[PDB]
Amino acid sequence: ELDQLRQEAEQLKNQIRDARKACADATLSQITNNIDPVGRIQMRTRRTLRGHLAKIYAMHWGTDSRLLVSASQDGKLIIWDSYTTNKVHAIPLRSSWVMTCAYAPSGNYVACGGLDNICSIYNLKTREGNVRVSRELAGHTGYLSCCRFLDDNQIVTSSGDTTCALWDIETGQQTTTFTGHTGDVMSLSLAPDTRLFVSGACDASAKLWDVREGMCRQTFTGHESDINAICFFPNGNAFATGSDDATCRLFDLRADQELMTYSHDNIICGITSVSFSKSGRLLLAGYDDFNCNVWDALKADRAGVLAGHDNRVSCLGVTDDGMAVATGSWDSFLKIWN
Amino acid sequence: EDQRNEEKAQREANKKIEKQLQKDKQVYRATHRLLLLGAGESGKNTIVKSGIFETKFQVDKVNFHMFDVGAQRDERRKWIQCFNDVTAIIFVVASSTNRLQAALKLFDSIWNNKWLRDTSVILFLNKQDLLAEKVLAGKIEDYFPEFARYTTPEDATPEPGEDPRVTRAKYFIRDEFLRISTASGDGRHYCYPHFTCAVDTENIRRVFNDCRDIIQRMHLRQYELL
């Protein structure tokens, strides 16, 4: 009977494959074959933030596109004011193995988690004026790879136990559990409307969930190795994934298929970070060869290089207004490019 | 004016945070974190001395942080990269399915990893008494066919002197690890193998000496002497 179920699943996968093949009629490159190229744009290191001791695993921009938060393996969480290159709120962490950090949309809270299998929520503004652990969430049996604030009262986390969880910060309990990933989830990205979110895991698959009840609407399988980073298109109808097979891919919703892959022959290092520009024309991908490649998302031709680091980048982000891009690195340096 | 006022307030807050941060840097520099890794749960990592476990111990007024992985899945492909900056990886192997082959494969994967290529390994061979009991009693020979051709090295220095067969087996296992260590990498990181009987307190001294040698080699590499 197990063999019968395996045959049933294989037949269903084949049927989905034929449905996708019938859906595809013309590649995205053919559509954007007459589009004027970007023009080989170059961006210099506008600023360098150098307050961390150990490698920087994650950083997240604020809503105002002025304040950012960075987490480093020296157990440090620093909120930089990028305009005046100043720093505020150097938050010490209970566990020094933080691997992710998030900034609340309202700007009132900061999340961080790591090898402790726990997500700590810190209240930025207090009557005492000192940042303290507002709440500790521990419903994960594996390391927290990513976390994102939903509405300043709910948080979505992905862990190394192959599960995602939507929490309630007030009650400190798991509200919803998203399951279906084989490999541990490495990254997640919220939709602009906060109605859906995509998650990329250690398997080649990426799954799209809806936070209201979380039943894994769609699954995309185009990569060949672990999906390290995921980012969501500004219009909300597409997303981009970066994997360890040294390729980036652009999937789209409501078509359940690949659109275009970004890769080069002389690239043999995996992707660690992926982000989109304000209009979505540019796709910024961080690499393991200490460089950041800026791709024309419509033509899959390299448009820029951002080689300002000494070690792997491991994190990058673009401001809400698209003014500047911040890249962290394992050399304990943050760089703001514009 | 508001703008100079808030700029001054932000600058003084930055100065205070800078003071606290240099104070924290002083503590962080003199710590020498280590990663205590074991092939399986059978290995007696605990007596060597959720999510992650911390152990603080001082040797000759030198602080040491040992991190033991707890509530994590068996797939260590991703989170092991968090330990590329540790001073050493204390790899504990029970020298008593073929668990030895699994330990060898794990050691090879750790040694040949791209991000751990600069991290040194302190190899501990536990279950020495168990290995002696198994060797004297009438599974090592069949698991490793090359053991028959193996001969005890000249610098065996068998201090316990329990048998000329136990020493041969333990040195065969040590050479099995050293083959990978020497072949895969040269001039970047070093492997320090030791025999432990799990009833001795000298393990922390051996770890201290190996860490001293590791940092000496790292400093020597700055001048390209090594």
């Epitope: 360890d244 | 899945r73 068996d74």
Partner: nanobody, 128 residues
């Protein structure tokens, strides 16, 4: 998607010969190092052998060193394991595993349970 399908191997008399063929799809075969692992009844996954890209770095576990041989055809996108002298204690489910990262001399967690880039496996039983 990454799909590894193993074929061959049934009931074989002790001392007999067998051939296991692993067909791979969804990735560039030549970029990855391949592995053969096995799981005995009630024993857990154990590593049997591995071969690097384009061969030339073959290695086996000690138990099967003199008997089993592993080869690969990059053009045919296939992995082969020949078992020329079977013994009763190697009755197991055999899996074709593809290591997680391309262009890597190291590769992790093939023997770990719930591993993504592993096939369904074939039963190989040796008995009278």
């Amino acid at each position: 998607q990454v799909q590894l399908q193993e074929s061959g191997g049934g009931l074989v008399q002790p001392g007999g010969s067998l051939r296991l063929s692993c067909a791979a799809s969804g990735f560039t075969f030549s970029n990855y190092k391949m592995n053969w692992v096995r799981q005995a009844p009630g024993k857990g996954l154990e590593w049997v052998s591995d071969i690097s890209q384009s061969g030339a770095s073959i290695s086996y576990t000690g138990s099967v060193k003199g008997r089993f041989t592993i080869s690969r055809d990059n053009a045919k996108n296939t992995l082969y394991l020949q078992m020329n002298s079977l013994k009763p204690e190697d009755t197991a489910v055999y899996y074709c595993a593809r290591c997680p990262a391309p262009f890597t001399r190291d590769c992790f967690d093939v023997t770990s349970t719930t591993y993504a880039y592993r096939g369904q496996g074939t039963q190989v039983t040796v008995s009278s």
